[PDB]
Amino acid sequence: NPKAFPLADAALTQQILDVVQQAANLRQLKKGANEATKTLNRGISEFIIMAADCEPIEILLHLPLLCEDKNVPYVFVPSRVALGRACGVSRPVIAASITTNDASAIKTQIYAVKDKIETLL
Amino acid sequence: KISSLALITNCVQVLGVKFYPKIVPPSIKLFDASLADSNPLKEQLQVAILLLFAGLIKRNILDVLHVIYFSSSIRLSVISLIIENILKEVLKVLFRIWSTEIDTVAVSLFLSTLESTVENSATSQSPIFFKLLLSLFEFRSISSFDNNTISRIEASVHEISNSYVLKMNDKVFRPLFVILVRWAFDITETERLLAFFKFFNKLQENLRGIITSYFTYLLEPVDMLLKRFISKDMENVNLRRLVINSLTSSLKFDRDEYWKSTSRFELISVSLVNQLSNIENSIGKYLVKAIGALASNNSGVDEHNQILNKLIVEHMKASCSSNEKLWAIRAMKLIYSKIGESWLVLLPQLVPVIAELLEDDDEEIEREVRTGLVKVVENVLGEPFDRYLD
Amino acid sequence: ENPADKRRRLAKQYLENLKSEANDILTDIIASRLKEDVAEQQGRVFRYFGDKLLISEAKQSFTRVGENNLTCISCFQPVLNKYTFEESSNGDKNKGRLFAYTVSKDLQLTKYDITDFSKRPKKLKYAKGGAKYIPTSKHEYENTTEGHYDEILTVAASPDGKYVVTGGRDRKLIVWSTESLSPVKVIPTKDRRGEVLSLAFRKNSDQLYASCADFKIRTYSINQFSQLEILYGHHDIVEDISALAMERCVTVGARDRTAMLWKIPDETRLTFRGGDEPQKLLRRWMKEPLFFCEGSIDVVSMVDDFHFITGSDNGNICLWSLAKKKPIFTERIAHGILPEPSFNDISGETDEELRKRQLQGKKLLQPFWITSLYAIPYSNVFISGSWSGSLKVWKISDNLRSFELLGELSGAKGVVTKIQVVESGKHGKEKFRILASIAKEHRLGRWIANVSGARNGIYSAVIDQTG
Amino acid sequence: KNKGRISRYLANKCSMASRIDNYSEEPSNVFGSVLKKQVEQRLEFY
Amino acid sequence: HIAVGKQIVNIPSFMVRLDSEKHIDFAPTSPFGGARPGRVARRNAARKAEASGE
Amino acid sequence: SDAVTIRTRKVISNPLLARKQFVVDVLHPNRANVSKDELREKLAEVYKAEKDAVSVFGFRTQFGGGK
RNA sequence: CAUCUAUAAUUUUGAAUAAAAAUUGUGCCGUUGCUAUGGC
16 A cells, blocks of 8 residues: 555554553543544644554555644554454454543653654654 | 133122131032142132132131142232131141041141241140141151151251240140150150251350250160160161260250269269260260360369269270270260369379370371370460470 | 271272282282372373373364353362362262353353263253343442353362352352252452453362452452452453462453462562564574564463463463573464455455455554463473364473474364363273363353354363373 | 444544545545444444 | 552652552552541541440 | 561581571561461461460561561 | 262163163245255
């Protein structure tokens, strides 16, 4: 898929899914395509993780428009099943959004991974 | 057939809305119809007989209940209807219909009637009830049933007898108690003793200690039975369990110093220690509980303690059997744990016995002696035992 | 009449049996057999049937079950004591009746008889939960409703053959009798997020290590129905647990990718981390394909008291020794990569070449997940499983530095939730049943539902040995 | 109540259909048809 | 109420490390992450039980 | 709920004073402060010595409790 | 857990029913034969 342009390599996926898992435990994370779109319109999203093997790809390809329109970093990971396991819900999630909060224990990791994604863009 | 059924239910309706010389002749005719019948039409006929019975008992009772018995849930419900509507006459009905009885469903109906009667004076109802008890034990003797079935029946008759005697006042069935003992000691009669002693233990536990004069009536033939046991004429493990358990309950419940009497005391003590001689390895805990109860009852009297200790060391003499030795050892352990204070004076009559037992080779008895007896006696004395045992 | 003489009599009959079996084998040896029957106690792998097995004719038998989503299986196998000499089982009406206990997401616990190695597992008895066991307070320590009310998730049968203990997402842990399946005791985990994920009895004892999902590992004692201890130290959910005859249990926690070995009486632990890198593997292979990163360590089994194998989620099967922190021998994607998604399904666009361009070739490949992994204890083979529809039997070397694929078994189809092996026969002639609880979904979450031909059931595969 | 259920269900499937039809050059009656079949199975469930 | 691993801490100036920061949780003695409710709750419950008894 | 768990460390066989000296870790959750009498009975059962031989002293409960 | 009982097996009597001794692979549907496998 060339439409999934920024696709993470292995180590980048590992870092991203670890940050997603910590953000889910702290509950700084919003799961699902519609909930991620709502967070983006609210302007409270830190950054966007999407799946790549979603069936099909357009139903979340609607997101990069809003993503760089409000200038939010976004990334694609290969497996929506991996994304669901990392989010910590029993169903495969195709798009998750780390929100913004600075009274948060994982601010440093969030900023590191967001910087690395932005460099990949 | 259907015309007869319509006649029956029409009588049901018209008597429900509703004479006795026109009311008992249809009862006789209904008896005749029931005995003539005794096929689905016949079943519904039986149902209609029972409903007309239900109406008349709502608003020859022996034969009525006879047909009610021999004629399922409908039967149980109409039994309850009988007993809420209608009792000494009912008890006479129970006895006569039981002599008529002696199958299984009729037996269950009979027992349900009995339990309903007792949960529903009693001095007047007593002798018919006790004759019914004896007749049920004779049924246990001669029934063509299975063991678990008759044991279900015996458990039911035991619990209803406990309820009835509990309802009864205590001074008035005293001669009835004497005649019950007379029936029990005068079927192979081992079953008589068995049922009577189940009954007696349950009564002793329920009434809790006002059975002392009844055991005063009882003490001689039970001593004859204990002597039969120690001579090993009988062998009934459960009967011996029952005798010893009754004796325990009486000893532990006597709070009137009744067992401070010397003659009864020496009788029961001699019989119990010889029972320890002829004991069997299952009932040993029962017998050591018995001897501990006897000692805790006669704790105040030193000569009683002395003859107790003499009998026990006589039976734990080192030249004896392993089981008798070990059970006497457990009895001594229990006694010294319980009383422990009226026995230090008796203690120097027992160290040579301990020495020979420790020297014995059967390491079960050796370990039992060492651990149990020496640790409980060392704890009683405080400072250790190795100044007596050199 | 003396207990020492009774022990001597049983030992003399045992020696008669040993000499007779030595003669029948002949149609040194007895000393080696005695040293073996003791050498179970030392912590070194000795059971060396790594090449006597005949996998190519291992007879497979699927048994479909009624309920949905079997979650775990644990099979009780009676053995003989060497100290006393009666048996492992309790009753006399059992006499070595191989039993199996299966727990399933339908809240159903079921005991099968598996005593015969030719016929199918016969369903002896069962007990089902439901919603009538929901606690009335719901906000308290008291959770002791006699049944299960939500998602039982692990079972384990005690070695004495009296109890079997089940635990699930309802944060209780119930010990049931083995005959009537009656619940004799119920222990709440007393925690809001303390869901019980995996149990493991200490072998030939009654201590039970119950890896909960609140980052802690509770240890109990079933003969007294008590909770001895709580062990702390994992940074994610303590996913899987395994223990042997010693006072150690190895636990793998998933997202932290960490295997920790708990020495219980020393009250200490050892931490093992993985750490392979795609750049190092790529440069090393250039010095010589795909290299998947390590997401999470899913399952563990202790092969021996100094070595254990961890099946990760990214195809890795590692073998670790207690001396070296890094894995002494890794093994790459062990059940293959997953099949690629369809071009039409991944694009939704008429242009066929654009659909293939969506599929991208290699970049969207993910390896099979080693769902289950069981090392038959103190021995040199172990069974791995994924939803590849194929159990994989592997064999460790003699120097315990590597292992090789001994064989495959293709009768299974679905997610292999739990593998459990049972041996029987005479000491030289030992048949090995391999039960496997197979279900359509994973044990923990759903995450997958489209497996072609996956049916809920017990895959029983009997192997024999000739050598 | 089930009117509101069906309304929200149809709204979500409509949103997904609009996504694929805007970002697919030559869109697919097959995905449209399977999504319609899904909604029809829900309406049969009513 | 709050333990770091196994140890109940009640010092608000404890200066955690990274592993401890992952290990912080409620304590097993407390009514919050564990055992029986406090004296206020169970005294209120005893009061309501006696008031329903009368 | 409650089961006192005794473990011993640093077991030094000291044959000069004819003894075995160790360090006793007691775990008593949902409880407090098991007795020296109970510890001596249990250590006698473990080590197969007599309660008159066993001696213990110097116990210290940790903050929070349970050990 | 043991005992007892129950179902199911032999024995004897009777052509046999009958009598008693006495003893000791699925929740739903699908293909498919004398067990194997589809889908929900």
